[PDB]
Design an enzyme around this catalytic site. Sequence first.
Site, short mmCIF file in Angstrom:
data_model
loop_
_atom_site.label_atom_id
_atom_site.label_comp_id
_atom_site.label_asym_id
_atom_site.label_seq_id
_atom_site.Cartn_x
_atom_site.Cartn_y
_atom_site.Cartn_z
N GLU A 250 0.85 -1.24 0.00
CA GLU A 250 0.00 0.00 0.00
C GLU A 250 0.86 1.26 0.00
O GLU A 250 0.55 2.24 -0.71
CB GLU A 250 -0.86 -0.03 1.26
CG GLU A 250 -2.04 -1.08 1.17
CD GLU A 250 -3.03 -0.65 0.10
OE1 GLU A 250 -2.99 0.44 -0.42
OE2 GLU A 250 -3.87 -1.51 -0.22
N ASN B 249 -7.58 9.68 -5.11
CA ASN B 249 -8.40 8.86 -6.01
C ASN B 249 -9.27 9.73 -6.92
O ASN B 249 -9.44 10.93 -6.71
CB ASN B 249 -9.26 7.88 -5.19
CG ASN B 249 -8.39 7.22 -4.13
OD1 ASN B 249 -8.77 7.13 -2.96
ND2 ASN B 249 -7.25 6.75 -4.57
N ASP C 261 -12.45 9.73 -7.31
CA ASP C 261 -13.64 10.26 -6.60
C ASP C 261 -13.35 11.50 -5.77
O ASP C 261 -14.30 12.15 -5.26
CB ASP C 261 -14.33 9.14 -5.82
CG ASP C 261 -13.46 8.71 -4.65
OD1 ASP C 261 -12.33 9.21 -4.52
OD2 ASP C 261 -13.91 7.91 -3.82
N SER D 29 -11.43 11.48 -3.07
CA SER D 29 -11.01 11.07 -1.71
C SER D 29 -9.49 10.88 -1.73
O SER D 29 -8.93 10.80 -2.84
CB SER D 29 -11.69 9.74 -1.35
OG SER D 29 -11.26 8.72 -2.26
N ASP E 12 -6.08 8.62 0.18
CA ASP E 12 -5.61 7.48 1.00
C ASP E 12 -4.35 7.96 1.76
O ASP E 12 -3.54 8.67 1.21
CB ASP E 12 -5.26 6.29 0.11
CG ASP E 12 -6.42 5.72 -0.64
OD1 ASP E 12 -7.61 5.91 -0.41
OD2 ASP E 12 -6.09 4.91 -1.54
N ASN F 160 -8.70 5.49 3.60
CA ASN F 160 -9.38 6.40 2.64
C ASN F 160 -10.25 7.43 3.35
O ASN F 160 -10.99 7.09 4.29
CB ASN F 160 -10.27 5.48 1.74
CG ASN F 160 -10.95 6.35 0.69
OD1 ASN F 160 -12.08 6.78 0.91
ND2 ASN F 160 -10.27 6.70 -0.39
#
Length: 129
Positions: free
Chosen positions: A35, A46, A48, A50, A52, A59
Amino acid sequence: KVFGRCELAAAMKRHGLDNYRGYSLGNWVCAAKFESNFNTQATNRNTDGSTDYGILQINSRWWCNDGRTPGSRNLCNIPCSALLSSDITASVNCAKKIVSDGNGMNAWVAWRNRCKGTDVQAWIRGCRL
């Protein structure tokens, strides 16, 4: 802070992640490796809108507040910035909520694609644990 493999395993073990919800330590270290490459300051945006955050790339759409994800839910009750600290307590606490949410470790795409069903025990081999 950029963790070494065994150092992270030792911290995660200490914070109660070994066998949490049936996931052995190796699954957690594997997840972190893919990750974030063990970097607590890792961030990724991301499509959308959002973002991370941290070692486990949690998220902002569900788990933390970053003040810029319209309609975020803040389930871990934490500023996303707390997820970037060199102390992984907030990341681990949040992760435990995520994994207990019903999809297990499948909430982490890199776990599902790169760790799931592999020999995860190789991620803790040689470590003093």
